[PDB]
Amino acid sequence: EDLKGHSVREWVSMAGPRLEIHHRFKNFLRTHVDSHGHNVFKERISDMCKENRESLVVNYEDLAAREHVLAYFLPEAPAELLQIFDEAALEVVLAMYPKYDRITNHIHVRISHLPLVEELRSLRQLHLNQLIRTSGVVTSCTGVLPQLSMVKYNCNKCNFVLGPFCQSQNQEVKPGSCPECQSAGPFEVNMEETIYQNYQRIRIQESPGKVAAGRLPRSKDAILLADLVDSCKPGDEIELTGIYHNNYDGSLNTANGFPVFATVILANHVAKKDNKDVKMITSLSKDQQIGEKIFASIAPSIYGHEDIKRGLALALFGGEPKNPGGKHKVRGDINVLLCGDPGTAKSQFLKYIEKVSSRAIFTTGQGLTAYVQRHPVSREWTLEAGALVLADRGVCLIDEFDKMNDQDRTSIHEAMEQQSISISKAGIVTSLQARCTVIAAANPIGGRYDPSLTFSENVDLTEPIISRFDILCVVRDTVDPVQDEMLARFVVGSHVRHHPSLPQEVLKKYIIYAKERVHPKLNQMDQDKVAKMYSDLRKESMATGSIPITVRHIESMIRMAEAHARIHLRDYVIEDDVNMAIRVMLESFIDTQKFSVMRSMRKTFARYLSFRRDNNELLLFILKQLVAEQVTYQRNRFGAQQDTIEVPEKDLVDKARQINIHNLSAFYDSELFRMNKFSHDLKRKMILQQF
Amino acid sequence: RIQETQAELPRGSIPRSLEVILRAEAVESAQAGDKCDFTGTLIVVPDVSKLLSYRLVFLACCVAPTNPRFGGKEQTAESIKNQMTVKEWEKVFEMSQDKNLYHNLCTSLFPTIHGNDEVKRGVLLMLFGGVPKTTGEGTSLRGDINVCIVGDPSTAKSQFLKHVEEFSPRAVYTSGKASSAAGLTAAVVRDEESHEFVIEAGALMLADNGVCCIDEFDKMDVRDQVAIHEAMEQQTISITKAGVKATLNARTSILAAANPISGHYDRSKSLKQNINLSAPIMSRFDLFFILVDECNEVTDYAIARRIVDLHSRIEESIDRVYSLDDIRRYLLFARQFKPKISKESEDFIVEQYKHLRQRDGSGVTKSSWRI
Amino acid sequence: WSLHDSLCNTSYTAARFKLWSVHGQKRLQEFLADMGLPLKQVKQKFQAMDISLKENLREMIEQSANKFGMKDMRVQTFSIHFGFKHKFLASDVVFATMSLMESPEKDGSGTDHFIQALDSLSRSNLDKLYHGLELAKKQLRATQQTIASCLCTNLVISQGPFLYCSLMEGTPDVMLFSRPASLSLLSKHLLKSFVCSTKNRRCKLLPLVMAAPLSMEHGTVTVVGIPPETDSSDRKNFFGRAFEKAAESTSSRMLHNHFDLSVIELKAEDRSKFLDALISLLS
Amino acid sequence: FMPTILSRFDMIFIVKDEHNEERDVMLAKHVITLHVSIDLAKLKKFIAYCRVKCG
DNA sequence: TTTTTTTTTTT
Ligand SMILES: Nc1ncnc2c1ncn2[C@@H]1O[C@H](COP(=O)(O)OP(=O)(O)OP(O)(O)=S)[C@@H](O)[C@H]1O
Ligand SMILES: Nc1ncnc2c1ncn2[C@@H]1O[C@H](COP(=O)(O)OP(=O)(O)O)[C@@H](O)[C@H]1O
Ligand SMILES: [Mg+2]
Ligand SMILES: [Zn+2]
């Protein structure tokens, strides 16, 4: 019988049960097929040996299936079963690979998903020395320090090395008196025969919103040994699995006044819970019309703003960070700066880009650089990373840009055109790297953006800073009846399906793929296609109170050139996406202009550039204004928010004569204006507007 | 560590405190901000560093709330509808079936306030609370509504707040001039015993899922109105300090009272010029009750009559139905539904949002804090 | 080199192991693991590898290559020692000389590299040999990055009686093979990788013909021809006649400039005019 | 700008902006001079010796 | 060598 009347701890420590368990584990290691007739621990051990990993995973459920008695002995006395399993897996591997002795000569078996997921606040004294599975964020980690594992001293009066004592993680090992000269004294270690092992200590704490319902969040310690160290960084969400081991502390006893012991989790398996094939992508990119299909995949909820959707999509994948051969270090990062009156889903545009992107971080402007910090655990005055070095390759989401401080302002600009920070702090003089794309949103002064002044006035920002941004989108608002329903219905419906009674799969894997397998090239056929525009537009802008497109705009345009090499896999500059690059680089410049200049420059260029746009949107641009202005008339004399606005026809083609389309019936058939709640009548000429 | 309850404080004294030691399965019954009722033995404890000096310590064995709203034993409609004693449940039903209920809670909650019929209603709808939702992405919609009052001197502002804070259980009361940033939201304190920086809970936290009554909201400093907005927006409280990194929940509803700039409320300007709150904060309230002391004379008889009545018949002339203990029960019951929206009501709502924007329309009139 | 960078580049284990497809790159890992060679010693230079591993390396490699289908792994060569640290195998001198004479970057007339390679055969010039071993490395690491192109892109056309390929200038490290002498080896290794790669039974026994651009100004390419590959190929090529008769039939412009006949320079426009007549001629 | 902080200098150049279309041809030139991407390296080492040898 | 609160000199 493998169960007799003793303590489970002391049953397994007896020679008989020890040997029985030892032989029992081998038979499971060698013979265990999984639903296909595959010795899983034959291929898995192999894949472990093809990397020199000395760590074997044992899923607990199968151990319970193929073995009824061990999977019940295990979480009772795991300080010895996990030792016997080591010597079993060793003798298995040294049979499947008889030379592996030259690789670390020691195997640890981890254990995966015990069936007893638990909380971090419900650990009571019942669980002392019992295998446990938990969860929660990690909030610290010391450095990987070396700890004694098999110490060996040497006597100071005889030149003889004492016995190889083992080190237990509760009390400093104590050597006796020299069995060769009885010279009991202060021995010192012998650095040459002693064996060491890695070591790291972390402080895990409850997840933010998971269980911390109406109280404060508790925390615990954990000790990662040799193979585990650096499995997790501050901010990760992990799920430990480890003996819950206690040890006596003399300080707590002097604070609480009672005999109180400290506890710590000797981690045994750490499995992160976070976010981590082309043959479709070939034709999906070869659709030739992936632009529209991807634009309406970001900003999943927020309606409208297919304008700024374009710019932010351009920013997300990025561009090409070419190295100029003249030692000029042009940058390959697109930085955006939103702005607009409060209540227009700017912050949501930030938060969704937090999710969709990768390796992203976030901050408010109300910590930007590395700073000296007294470590929670180690109690040393180290240096900690800021908020511009954690996006050293990804994105940095700044919020409340206006609320930055003078030191913060003088520190943000340095990283734009240099992308490299120096820290001559109290810690030590260093020079680190920072290659991030900045995505921020400012606010309008006076609680509303008013486009009589230039944008450089309502933004409340230092002038050489706005130059460090590529795109300048301006969010604005207006009381517009037909969009009131459009936005209301959306919000109301989003409140109907959220309460307890291109999808997000293509584009994440796509920003992973298309980030890598493209390297856009640069020919010289576009080199003269642009200057013909600059020579004109420079005069056109300088003529009035404005500064024309300058070199820091040509750089942004040429950066956004490749911004579509990532979507199309095109990677070849063509006179097609140059129509797009110039279009965007003027889109982000006509808006940041004066009252009558934002329209004079439009009347020139928006008709000059031959916007590669819909022929239909230019139809709407007319009658939308012609009905809005008529409502404005019929309010300033009557005041009644009338139900059905009425506008006869003749007015529309009068203004359509300027763009020379005169097409109404092919637009009347088009359902691209029914949504805007309009009408027309052949015999009445009325463009009847309902709402 | 427990602190002397409020109703025992001798006048003109700072409240004492003592250490209680829960030592069993009773180990996490008491949380911060609660009003439990401990029952154990008083013991003496030495100073173990020199093992003298002794200090008193309470050694509790049982702990239970001081006044159970439902005397059965102490979370959905049925778990509570079980503890309802026969009279309790035959009364809650009677009220829920009552018609004109929405006028017998006002008349029975604020029995000594003549007028302002449009403020009591808002206060009630604040007490009942909305439906808190969590979007699938991971964000969360605010479920409870916030309310601010702004008015002339001596118009019964602090009286609404005192009424609400003495009626409601787990609702805290603070002034604005005598507070702090790290006292409202959350602090960080060095416990030299553990020689570590730990988190202290603030007024916005030990009133969680209740109501925080801020009087004189516009006397707070410029930097103390920032920490409160960072909490009123995301419903959470971040901490990033010496060795502490955390994010705490705060699902309180705020009832704030303020004063116009220069004493009186000037009715020829927008709101942003009559009050000195920040710009962001004025957006996070979404219910304002501007009170004005219209120099009338038919009221100045009514208010006079009511005050002199209250002062002549001190405990009488208050004839409210639905005694105050009963309303707590009805309010603990009816705060466990999650009403839904029918399609007709959704259409009505979008039409009303249509009919609200255009009132602010140009030409005919003008209003304050644009819709 | 290191023991790892020389398995990934010998065009005899870079073919069997199929070290261009992630699916079979783990074969190398398994081969290393079957010997007890740490993955950290195998990546380091061979002269610095620990002394306890290299005892019987040349036997534990021949053995563990039977278990993978590579039984011709030991060859018969010679080796020379001069002094304290000078130890050459007779196939290192060859790969160094062969790459001093065919260095890509040209610094004068055609007989400027010849002299520098004739120099590095006497023992008084061990500073050129020891230098011509860094070109021979740079070449071998820029050949398995081309045979990896024409096999993860399938640029080996089966044009009938013979395979066929061609190159693109835009691909990096394709101007290195511009010389009409350093092109034969690239093709002869391409055939060895291909024959091992393809699944057909016909293509595995067809000779290859290759063309790569020579001169952009004259607009001409260079063309070679290599016998049908096999283990015991007699090595008796036959293209010096085919190309001659094909240029004779089409009556195009060709140059049989070298001493071997199977290398020709051809106008970029007479490519197809030549190739079709050749297809018909070989038949 | 006071007549005194202005007088703290000695040389005033009111720089002028030309928008001429031949000037714009110069600008179109300068466009690709950046689009693509007596020497200073000896000018500096010349000054370093000129400043220190003339009186 | 860290927070937080409170008083007084200084840019
Ligand atoms: N409408 C009213 N009905 C009944 N009593 C009233 C009314 N308005 C004022 N009072 C009484 O007058 C006093 C009002 O003082 P408070 O309400 O405490 O001051 P307040 O309204 O906060 O104004 P300030 O700004 O703080 S002085 C109380 O004693 C009320 O009982
Ligand atoms: N068009 C819209 N679609 C959806 N939600 C919107 C829209 N406009 C405003 N919102 C709401 O407004 C909130 C965003 O406010 P925000 O832009 O953060 O204000 P501020 O810019 O003052 O910080 C969102 O939570 C969203 O619910
Ligand atoms: Mg008051
Ligand atoms: Zn001794």
PDB file of N, CA and C in Angstrom, chain B residues 121-176:
ATOM      1  N   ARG B 121     -35.529  66.958  -5.555  1.00  0.00           N
ATOM      2  CA  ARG B 121     -35.646  65.910  -6.561  1.00  0.00           C
ATOM      3  C   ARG B 121     -34.277  65.464  -7.041  1.00  0.00           C
ATOM      4  N   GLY B 122     -33.419  66.419  -7.376  1.00  0.00           N
ATOM      5  CA  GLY B 122     -32.085  66.064  -7.811  1.00  0.00           C
ATOM      6  C   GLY B 122     -31.314  65.321  -6.745  1.00  0.00           C
ATOM      7  N   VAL B 123     -31.466  65.733  -5.489  1.00  0.00           N
ATOM      8  CA  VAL B 123     -30.745  65.057  -4.417  1.00  0.00           C
ATOM      9  C   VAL B 123     -31.203  63.611  -4.300  1.00  0.00           C
ATOM     10  N   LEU B 124     -32.507  63.373  -4.429  1.00  0.00           N
ATOM     11  CA  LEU B 124     -33.017  62.005  -4.387  1.00  0.00           C
ATOM     12  C   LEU B 124     -32.440  61.167  -5.515  1.00  0.00           C
ATOM     13  N   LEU B 125     -32.593  61.643  -6.749  1.00  0.00           N
ATOM     14  CA  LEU B 125     -32.038  60.913  -7.877  1.00  0.00           C
ATOM     15  C   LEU B 125     -30.542  60.707  -7.734  1.00  0.00           C
ATOM     16  N   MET B 126     -29.863  61.539  -6.953  1.00  0.00           N
ATOM     17  CA  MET B 126     -28.462  61.266  -6.675  1.00  0.00           C
ATOM     18  C   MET B 126     -28.310  60.116  -5.695  1.00  0.00           C
ATOM     19  N   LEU B 127     -29.183  60.055  -4.687  1.00  0.00           N
ATOM     20  CA  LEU B 127     -29.094  58.978  -3.707  1.00  0.00           C
ATOM     21  C   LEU B 127     -29.389  57.619  -4.312  1.00  0.00           C
ATOM     22  N   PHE B 128     -30.309  57.539  -5.269  1.00  0.00           N
ATOM     23  CA  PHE B 128     -30.655  56.218  -5.788  1.00  0.00           C
ATOM     24  C   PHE B 128     -29.581  55.669  -6.714  1.00  0.00           C
ATOM     25  N   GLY B 129     -28.993  56.508  -7.541  1.00  0.00           N
ATOM     26  CA  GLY B 129     -27.874  56.033  -8.334  1.00  0.00           C
ATOM     27  C   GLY B 129     -28.314  55.439  -9.653  1.00  0.00           C
ATOM     28  N   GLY B 130     -27.422  55.514 -10.631  1.00  0.00           N
ATOM     29  CA  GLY B 130     -27.644  54.929 -11.935  1.00  0.00           C
ATOM     30  C   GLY B 130     -27.069  53.534 -12.036  1.00  0.00           C
ATOM     31  N   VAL B 131     -26.964  53.053 -13.269  1.00  0.00           N
ATOM     32  CA  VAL B 131     -26.513  51.694 -13.553  1.00  0.00           C
ATOM     33  C   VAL B 131     -25.044  51.757 -13.958  1.00  0.00           C
ATOM     34  N   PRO B 132     -24.139  51.137 -13.213  1.00  0.00           N
ATOM     35  CA  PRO B 132     -22.721  51.172 -13.587  1.00  0.00           C
ATOM     36  C   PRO B 132     -22.353  50.078 -14.570  1.00  0.00           C
ATOM     37  N   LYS B 133     -21.783  50.458 -15.705  1.00  0.00           N
ATOM     38  CA  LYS B 133     -21.510  49.542 -16.801  1.00  0.00           C
ATOM     39  C   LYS B 133     -20.012  49.454 -17.040  1.00  0.00           C
ATOM     40  N   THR B 134     -19.573  48.328 -17.584  1.00  0.00           N
ATOM     41  CA  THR B 134     -18.173  48.108 -17.916  1.00  0.00           C
ATOM     42  C   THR B 134     -18.074  47.715 -19.380  1.00  0.00           C
ATOM     43  N   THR B 135     -17.423  48.555 -20.175  1.00  0.00           N
ATOM     44  CA  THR B 135     -17.247  48.255 -21.586  1.00  0.00           C
ATOM     45  C   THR B 135     -16.319  47.060 -21.760  1.00  0.00           C
ATOM     46  N   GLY B 136     -16.517  46.333 -22.863  1.00  0.00           N
ATOM     47  CA  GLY B 136     -15.786  45.091 -23.062  1.00  0.00           C
ATOM     48  C   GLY B 136     -14.288  45.292 -23.184  1.00  0.00           C
ATOM     49  N   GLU B 137     -13.869  46.450 -23.697  1.00  0.00           N
ATOM     50  CA  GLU B 137     -12.442  46.710 -23.851  1.00  0.00           C
ATOM     51  C   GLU B 137     -11.729  46.694 -22.507  1.00  0.00           C
ATOM     52  N   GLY B 138     -12.348  47.269 -21.479  1.00  0.00           N
ATOM     53  CA  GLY B 138     -11.731  47.331 -20.169  1.00  0.00           C
ATOM     54  C   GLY B 138     -11.979  48.643 -19.454  1.00  0.00           C
ATOM     55  N   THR B 139     -12.595  49.594 -20.148  1.00  0.00           N
ATOM     56  CA  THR B 139     -12.929  50.880 -19.551  1.00  0.00           C
ATOM     57  C   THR B 139     -14.175  50.706 -18.690  1.00  0.00           C
ATOM     58  N   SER B 140     -14.758  51.809 -18.230  1.00  0.00           N
ATOM     59  CA  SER B 140     -15.945  51.702 -17.399  1.00  0.00           C
ATOM     60  C   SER B 140     -16.699  53.017 -17.419  1.00  0.00           C
ATOM     61  N   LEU B 141     -18.008  52.927 -17.598  1.00  0.00           N
ATOM     62  CA  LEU B 141     -18.862  54.098 -17.553  1.00  0.00           C
ATOM     63  C   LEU B 141     -19.194  54.440 -16.109  1.00  0.00           C
ATOM     64  N   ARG B 142     -19.208  55.732 -15.802  1.00  0.00           N
ATOM     65  CA  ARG B 142     -19.572  56.170 -14.464  1.00  0.00           C
ATOM     66  C   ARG B 142     -21.044  55.890 -14.220  1.00  0.00           C
ATOM     67  N   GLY B 143     -21.348  55.348 -13.049  1.00  0.00           N
ATOM     68  CA  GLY B 143     -22.700  54.912 -12.777  1.00  0.00           C
ATOM     69  C   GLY B 143     -23.504  55.863 -11.921  1.00  0.00           C
ATOM     70  N   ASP B 144     -22.827  56.609 -11.061  1.00  0.00           N
ATOM     71  CA  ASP B 144     -23.475  57.501 -10.118  1.00  0.00           C
ATOM     72  C   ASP B 144     -23.296  58.945 -10.551  1.00  0.00           C
ATOM     73  N   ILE B 145     -24.253  59.771 -10.183  1.00  0.00           N
ATOM     74  CA  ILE B 145     -24.317  61.145 -10.647  1.00  0.00           C
ATOM     75  C   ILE B 145     -23.783  62.067  -9.564  1.00  0.00           C
ATOM     76  N   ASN B 146     -23.181  63.172  -9.987  1.00  0.00           N
ATOM     77  CA  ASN B 146     -22.630  64.177  -9.094  1.00  0.00           C
ATOM     78  C   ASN B 146     -23.495  65.424  -9.145  1.00  0.00           C
ATOM     79  N   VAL B 147     -23.530  66.170  -8.044  1.00  0.00           N
ATOM     80  CA  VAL B 147     -24.448  67.305  -7.960  1.00  0.00           C
ATOM     81  C   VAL B 147     -23.782  68.452  -7.220  1.00  0.00           C
ATOM     82  N   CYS B 148     -23.886  69.654  -7.780  1.00  0.00           N
ATOM     83  CA  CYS B 148     -23.333  70.862  -7.192  1.00  0.00           C
ATOM     84  C   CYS B 148     -24.432  71.895  -7.001  1.00  0.00           C
ATOM     85  N   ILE B 149     -24.343  72.645  -5.910  1.00  0.00           N
ATOM     86  CA  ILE B 149     -25.283  73.712  -5.601  1.00  0.00           C
ATOM     87  C   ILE B 149     -24.518  75.022  -5.532  1.00  0.00           C
ATOM     88  N   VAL B 150     -25.136  76.096  -6.012  1.00  0.00           N
ATOM     89  CA  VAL B 150     -24.497  77.403  -6.099  1.00  0.00           C
ATOM     90  C   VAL B 150     -25.560  78.450  -5.826  1.00  0.00           C
ATOM     91  N   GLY B 151     -25.350  79.296  -4.825  1.00  0.00           N
ATOM     92  CA  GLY B 151     -26.422  80.225  -4.523  1.00  0.00           C
ATOM     93  C   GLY B 151     -26.002  81.379  -3.641  1.00  0.00           C
ATOM     94  N   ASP B 152     -26.958  82.279  -3.428  1.00  0.00           N
ATOM     95  CA  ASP B 152     -26.855  83.447  -2.568  1.00  0.00           C
ATOM     96  C   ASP B 152     -26.582  83.023  -1.135  1.00  0.00           C
ATOM     97  N   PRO B 153     -26.180  83.937  -0.260  1.00  0.00           N
ATOM     98  CA  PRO B 153     -26.000  83.571   1.142  1.00  0.00           C
ATOM     99  C   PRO B 153     -27.308  83.168   1.786  1.00  0.00           C
ATOM    100  N   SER B 154     -27.202  82.256   2.737  1.00  0.00           N
ATOM    101  CA  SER B 154     -28.318  81.806   3.555  1.00  0.00           C
ATOM    102  C   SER B 154     -29.520  81.425   2.696  1.00  0.00           C
ATOM    103  N   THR B 155     -29.324  80.386   1.883  1.00  0.00           N
ATOM    104  CA  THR B 155     -30.380  79.837   1.041  1.00  0.00           C
ATOM    105  C   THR B 155     -30.557  78.342   1.252  1.00  0.00           C
ATOM    106  N   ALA B 156     -30.135  77.819   2.400  1.00  0.00           N
ATOM    107  CA  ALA B 156     -30.191  76.392   2.695  1.00  0.00           C
ATOM    108  C   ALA B 156     -29.399  75.590   1.658  1.00  0.00           C
ATOM    109  N   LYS B 157     -28.093  75.826   1.660  1.00  0.00           N
ATOM    110  CA  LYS B 157     -27.158  74.949   0.975  1.00  0.00           C
ATOM    111  C   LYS B 157     -26.576  73.924   1.932  1.00  0.00           C
ATOM    112  N   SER B 158     -25.942  74.375   3.006  1.00  0.00           N
ATOM    113  CA  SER B 158     -25.385  73.440   3.963  1.00  0.00           C
ATOM    114  C   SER B 158     -26.456  72.614   4.648  1.00  0.00           C
ATOM    115  N   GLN B 159     -27.725  72.978   4.511  1.00  0.00           N
ATOM    116  CA  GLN B 159     -28.760  72.165   5.126  1.00  0.00           C
ATOM    117  C   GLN B 159     -29.064  70.920   4.306  1.00  0.00           C
ATOM    118  N   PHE B 160     -29.086  71.021   2.977  1.00  0.00           N
ATOM    119  CA  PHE B 160     -29.195  69.812   2.172  1.00  0.00           C
ATOM    120  C   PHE B 160     -28.050  68.858   2.467  1.00  0.00           C
ATOM    121  N   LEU B 161     -26.832  69.376   2.558  1.00  0.00           N
ATOM    122  CA  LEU B 161     -25.688  68.505   2.789  1.00  0.00           C
ATOM    123  C   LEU B 161     -25.748  67.866   4.166  1.00  0.00           C
ATOM    124  N   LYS B 162     -26.136  68.622   5.189  1.00  0.00           N
ATOM    125  CA  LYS B 162     -26.231  68.018   6.509  1.00  0.00           C
ATOM    126  C   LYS B 162     -27.333  66.976   6.560  1.00  0.00           C
ATOM    127  N   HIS B 163     -28.467  67.242   5.912  1.00  0.00           N
ATOM    128  CA  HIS B 163     -29.529  66.247   5.853  1.00  0.00           C
ATOM    129  C   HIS B 163     -29.032  64.960   5.225  1.00  0.00           C
ATOM    130  N   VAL B 164     -28.411  65.066   4.056  1.00  0.00           N
ATOM    131  CA  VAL B 164     -27.967  63.874   3.347  1.00  0.00           C
ATOM    132  C   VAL B 164     -26.938  63.115   4.170  1.00  0.00           C
ATOM    133  N   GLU B 165     -26.011  63.826   4.804  1.00  0.00           N
ATOM    134  CA  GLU B 165     -24.949  63.106   5.487  1.00  0.00           C
ATOM    135  C   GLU B 165     -25.398  62.513   6.809  1.00  0.00           C
ATOM    136  N   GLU B 166     -26.449  63.039   7.429  1.00  0.00           N
ATOM    137  CA  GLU B 166     -26.938  62.390   8.637  1.00  0.00           C
ATOM    138  C   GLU B 166     -27.912  61.273   8.329  1.00  0.00           C
ATOM    139  N   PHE B 167     -28.604  61.348   7.196  1.00  0.00           N
ATOM    140  CA  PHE B 167     -29.513  60.276   6.813  1.00  0.00           C
ATOM    141  C   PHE B 167     -28.739  59.066   6.318  1.00  0.00           C
ATOM    142  N   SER B 168     -27.924  59.258   5.290  1.00  0.00           N
ATOM    143  CA  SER B 168     -27.298  58.145   4.607  1.00  0.00           C
ATOM    144  C   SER B 168     -26.285  57.447   5.510  1.00  0.00           C
ATOM    145  N   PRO B 169     -26.166  56.128   5.393  1.00  0.00           N
ATOM    146  CA  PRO B 169     -25.064  55.417   6.040  1.00  0.00           C
ATOM    147  C   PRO B 169     -23.878  55.308   5.100  1.00  0.00           C
ATOM    148  N   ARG B 170     -22.680  55.418   5.671  1.00  0.00           N
ATOM    149  CA  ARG B 170     -21.441  55.441   4.898  1.00  0.00           C
ATOM    150  C   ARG B 170     -21.462  56.586   3.880  1.00  0.00           C
ATOM    151  N   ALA B 171     -21.502  57.796   4.431  1.00  0.00           N
ATOM    152  CA  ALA B 171     -21.377  59.028   3.663  1.00  0.00           C
ATOM    153  C   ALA B 171     -20.608  60.008   4.528  1.00  0.00           C
ATOM    154  N   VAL B 172     -19.583  60.628   3.966  1.00  0.00           N
ATOM    155  CA  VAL B 172     -18.654  61.415   4.762  1.00  0.00           C
ATOM    156  C   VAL B 172     -18.895  62.888   4.478  1.00  0.00           C
ATOM    157  N   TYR B 173     -18.472  63.744   5.406  1.00  0.00           N
ATOM    158  CA  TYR B 173     -18.717  65.178   5.321  1.00  0.00           C
ATOM    159  C   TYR B 173     -17.424  65.935   5.562  1.00  0.00           C
ATOM    160  N   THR B 174     -17.045  66.796   4.622  1.00  0.00           N
ATOM    161  CA  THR B 174     -15.826  67.575   4.756  1.00  0.00           C
ATOM    162  C   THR B 174     -16.049  68.984   4.238  1.00  0.00           C
ATOM    163  N   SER B 175     -15.369  69.938   4.853  1.00  0.00           N
ATOM    164  CA  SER B 175     -15.320  71.288   4.337  1.00  0.00           C
ATOM    165  C   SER B 175     -14.170  71.399   3.351  1.00  0.00           C
ATOM    166  N   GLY B 176     -13.991  72.582   2.786  1.00  0.00           N
ATOM    167  CA  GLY B 176     -13.015  72.736   1.734  1.00  0.00           C
ATOM    168  C   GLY B 176     -11.790  73.478   2.195  1.00  0.00           C
TER     169      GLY B 176
END
